Design a protein around this ligand. Structure first.
Ligand code: NAP
Ligand code: NAP
Ligand code: ZN
Ligand code: ZN
Lengths: 287, 287
């Protein structure tokens, strides 16, 4: 059909709350998915200052706004304003998706599932495997809490203290063996027997793209899968290093899209077309 | 440009708050005008219950919603949640347009001005004439207050004292003579010598378009002007009753557009294109 949202008096609103948000690809992505499925919703971006976060939930309820996506710096602070919080959300300790229904605002977190789907949808079910997660920030945290449910994960980081702390919280909360199922280490850890490595750090991300990868070619193999959460540029210096060894590369586009796909489902009750989302976003990145 | 609205992460939101709002044509009017001017705004409708009205302004301020239009039944109750209210809306006692600026919510009322422009574009300056206004709601208030500035008016309503109350109030604030310049009566007031009559009541408005007109063609006259504030249908019963006496008829299209046009300017600092607003509405009303 036509390009752009065909708005009328019955159109429902969904928005992204954060500060700043003017560069999010979310609106573009979701509006295309709404059209495709013929749903009468619109996605907009709301720049919310920290002191005003306390007024959004009751405003959304009063207005009839159906839901939100939450990003920096509100995913931790928004939790005290919601009526309920999904377990998967309570575990990670952060909300990035909200649904308002029947006067009840519920928090969710799809960053975890997203990074999983980003993988499975590309290499099938991921259970009982050796997975190394470089980084320990918000991304590595959501990823880890999800892939640790049924996999052996090793959180490697520049500041080990951070790695150790995360591995303990995961083993504890998910009830796993510390030094075995949920390990930690420096960025030096070796990949002998490692099935998949996931880069959850900004190394190689624009504007510092010409820096050396999180791991040289020497430790890379073909029998591996190297996914990079970065998506600017899509093919990082890490994926190059992994291409000179026929490894199955996956760029950040996967997590970004699927993370949204699950939220879409939560708001509309319908599954969105993954290619529409990608084509809308990938077209935004390139000319 | 595109057929629908091309939303991005910078698009600003303007909404209509009221109950109900599903059959409003305002979103149609304004989005059409936004696009024609290349402005990055989207106009949507919010269904707000009277009990939740108190959470909307802080919500709007929090999210960065730049303005609203206010319709039944919040035109008066919203005044207590605003920071400032301009002269007109304060005299009139009702707010139909809001603008959030510098963390400050301001109330305006474009109804009155809208009605005069629509009436004056049709028959030239309206001054020193006898005008009857049927009704006493927010619209009647706006139009009565505005035309009472330089014309003799008579407020006719089913609830007489309610019309008496409004007449006294107008005479009071405009330094007018309660007995002559501003009168009141029931729905059967004699129209001899009356130059213009305006229907500021829902009688005849969709979907109940077969009811009895607020005044029989008996009192109508060929050299009389009959304006109905209803725009859906485009030709109410009152107007086709007026046509059977060759009287000059005017529907509510002009008031709707001119009222919106003034609000448009207020939110954006830009003057919208009238033909665009006008035709966008007609096309959604007719076929
Ligand atoms: N595709 C998607 O769906 C998606 C979703 C979310 C984020 N991303 C992104 O994911 C990546 C990760 O970041 P984040 O925002 O989640 O968290 P974050 O707060 O940026 O996490 C910081 C991480 O970066 C490390 N790090 C930073 N500079 C480093 C360097 N020069 N050398 C070694 N380690 C370094 C930190 O080790 P320390 O703590 O010790 O500094 C830590 O592990 C980013 O590149 C960003 O582009 C993609
Ligand atoms: N075209 C435009 O720019 C524009 C702008 C604003 C409003 N409108 C509209 O203007 C019209 C007026 O209403 P409002 O929203 O301003 O105020 P309101 O709050 O709806 O005021 C109620 C009015 O309706 C009367 N009324 C209702 N049903 C009646 C009936 N069946 N018989 C006799 N009288 C009846 C009341 O007399 P009582 O109080 O005694 O009941 C009173 O005058 C509506 O039809 C609405 O669609 C058009
Ligand atoms: Zn800031
Ligand atoms: Zn309707």
């Amino acid at each position: 059909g036509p390009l752009g949202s065909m708005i009328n008096a019955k159109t429902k609103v969904i928005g992204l709350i954060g500060h700043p948000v003017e560069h999010s690809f979310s609106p573009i992505m979701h509006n295309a998915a709404f059209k495709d499925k013929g749903l009468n919703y619109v996605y907009v971006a709301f720049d919310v200052l920290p002191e005003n976060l306390k007024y959004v939930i009751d405003g959304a309820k009063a207005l009839g706004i159906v839901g939100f996506n939450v990003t920096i710096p509100h995913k931790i602070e928004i939790m005290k304003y919601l009526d309920e919080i999904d377990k998967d959300a309570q575990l990670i300790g952060a909300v990035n998706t909200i649904k308002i229904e029947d006067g009840k605002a519920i928090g969710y977190n799809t960053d975890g599932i997203g990074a999983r789907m980003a993988l499975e949808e590309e290499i099938g079910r991921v259970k009982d495997k050796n997975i190394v997660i470089y980084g320990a920030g918000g991304a590595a945290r959501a990823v880890a809490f999800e892939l640790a449910k049924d996999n052996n994960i090793i959180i490697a980081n520049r500041t080990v203290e951070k790695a150790e702390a995360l591995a303990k919280e995961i083993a504890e909360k998910l009830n796993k063996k510390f030094g075995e199922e949920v390990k930690f280490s420096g960025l030096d850890v070796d990949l002998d027997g490692v099935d998949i490595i996931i880069n959850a750090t900004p190394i190689g991300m624009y504007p510092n793209i010409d820096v050396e990868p999180i791991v040289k070619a020497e430790k890379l193999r073909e029998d591996m899968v190297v996914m990079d959460l970065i998506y600017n540029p899509l093919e990082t210096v890490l994926l190059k290093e992994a291409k000179k060894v026929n490894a199955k590369t996956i760029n950040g586009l996967g997590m970004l899209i699927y993370q949204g796909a699950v939220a879409f489902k939560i708001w509309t009750g319908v599954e969105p077309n993954i290619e529409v989302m990608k084509n809308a976003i990938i077209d935004k990145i390139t000319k």
